Amino acid sequence: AAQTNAPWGLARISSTSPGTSTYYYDESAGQGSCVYVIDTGIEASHPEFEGRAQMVKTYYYSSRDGNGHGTHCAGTVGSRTYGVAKKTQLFGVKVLDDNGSGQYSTIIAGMDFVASDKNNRNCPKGVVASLSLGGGYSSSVNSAAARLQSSGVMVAVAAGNNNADARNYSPASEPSVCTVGASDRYDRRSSFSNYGSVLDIFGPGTDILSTWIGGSTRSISGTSMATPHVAGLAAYLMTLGKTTAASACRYIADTANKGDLSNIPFGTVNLLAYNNYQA
Ligand SMILES: c1c[nH]c(-c2ccc3c(c2)OCCO3)c1
Numbered sequence: 171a172a173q174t175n176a177p178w179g180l181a182r183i184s185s186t187s188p189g190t191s192t193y194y195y196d197e198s199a200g201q202g203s204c205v206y207v208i209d210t211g212i213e214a215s216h217p218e219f220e221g222r223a224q225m226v227k228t229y230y231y232s233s234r235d236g237n238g239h240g241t242h243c244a245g246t247v248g249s250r251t252y253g254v255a256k257k258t259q260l261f262g263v264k265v266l267d268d269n270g271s272g273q274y275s276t277i278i279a280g281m282d283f284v285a286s287d288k289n290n291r292n293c294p295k296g297v298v299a300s301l302s303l304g305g306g307y308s309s310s311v312n313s314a315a316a317r318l319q320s321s322g323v324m325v326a327v328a329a330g331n332n333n334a335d336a337r338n339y340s341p342a343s344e345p346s347v348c349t350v351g352a353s354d355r356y357d358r359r360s361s362f363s364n365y366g367s368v369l370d371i372f373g374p375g376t377d378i379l380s381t382w383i384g385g386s387t388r389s390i391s392g393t394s395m396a397t398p399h400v401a402g403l404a405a406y407l408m409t410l411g412k413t414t415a416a417s418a419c420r421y422i423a424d425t426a427n428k429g430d431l432s433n434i435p436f437g438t439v440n441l442l443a444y445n446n447y448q449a
Pocket residue numbers: 365433434435436
């Protein structure tokens with residue numbers, strides 16, 4: 171399948187070169203997989219989700235996304251125009267309030283919720299969790315992310331936007347999950363992206379167009395935007411039978427575009443997420 175005039179990040183994940191604008195992908199499109207977006211919620215009624223999005227849990231007075239951040243991330247995972255995996259099922263878990271903030275105890279509860287809740291969903295091709303959130307180092311937060319991964323969910327987490335080593339942030343610093351840095355349309359490390367030995371992969375993170383609340387769209391930047399590219403890619407590859415939840419991060423790194431990013435510090439991987447789709 172070919173999507174013309176796609177957002178640059180989708181085109182990038184199916185290309186050996188920057189600077190193109192068509193996204194190429196197998197039409198299976200993540201059908202039969204599920205992706206949990208653990209964030210501020212998802213505006214499920216947005217036409218871009220085609221009925222494939224639903225809220226499954228909130229810790230606040232509403233499950234609605236009153237912020238936009240979670241809707242934008244969910245759109246990068248699986249919306250019809252802005253998503254990597256255009257036929258996946260999207261499940262929203264609102265651990266962040268409408269200002270984008272949340273207590274670690276709530277975030278931990280949300281991760282343990284997903285580890286159990288997947289047993290209440292139909293995801294024959296596998297389950298992914300996208301965590302575009304974090305804060306300072308916490309062993310408890312890292313342990314919750316490791317449990318979610320161990321339970322059979324491909325966990326992708328944002329590296330953080332501090333232009334610093336991700337070892338001091340959580341869940342970014344958890345070794346067993348997939349920690350995602352951000353790049354720009356010229357294959358430069360995004361100026362804000364964290365780095366370090368704990369990163370597993372880079373994805374498009376600067377000027378990413380996706381869904382927004384009020385049935386709208388907008389372009390924003392962050393490692394929060396790169397993470398759902400990798401989460402959607404995992405769901406797409408799992409549907410194709412090329413990998414499993416336990417191995418998807420390693421598979422994405424093994425099959426990535428290698429050595430093509432600039433301004434990557436010594437000791438950080440130079441790997442850019444790539445679907446290896448041959449049209
Ligand atoms: C080769 C030439 N310059 C660099 C470099 C150095 C320090 C860095 C960096 C990149 O990216 C950000 C963290 O600090 C490698």
